[PDB]
Nucleic acid binder design. Structure first.
Ligand code: ZN
Ligand code: ZN
Ligand code: ZN
Ligand code: ZN
Lengths: 65, 65
DNA sequence: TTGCCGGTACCGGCA
DNA sequence: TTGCCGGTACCGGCA
């Protein structure tokens, strides 16, 4: 299937192929090419966007309590 | 100089040139091509990264107070 | 102080 | 339930 990272960037991951050797892209990056079949990319943008929104209110809370 | 957005993505902005008409890239995007000579791109990545770190502690605070 | 290139990081969709 | 292309969004640096 796809190495976590490649799954993250939805980029062609060539694991199975290039044997025990970590995924190619994970080369250039030189990172732990993990294989968690049950992994699903994080939607960074949207995510952090939520984060910031949340973190906001909290302050506006401190604007009171 | 450079339209805020182009400044944001550090991308060639062609304002002065293409007259009163909003910057080109700001076309594809169709956004308010503002010109705030005193603007400086936000470092999204690094930024939000700080945010998250901060927002974290706060919770670990709530893990007490 | 400030413009942009050359190169990743991300992602919306389309299989 | 997923692999990935095609197209932005971001940025580290080098002027
Ligand atoms: Zn891979
Ligand atoms: Zn890999
Ligand atoms: Zn522009
Ligand atoms: Zn513009």
């Amino acid at each position: 299937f796809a190495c976590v990272e490649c799954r993250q960037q939805k980029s062609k991951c060539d694991a199975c192929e290039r044997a025990p050797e970590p995924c190619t892209k994970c080369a250039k990056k030189n990172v732990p090419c993990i294989l968690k079949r049950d992994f699903r990319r994080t939607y960074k943008r949207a995510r952090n966007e939520a984060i910031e929104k949340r973190f906001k209110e909290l302050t506006r809370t401190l604007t009171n309590l």
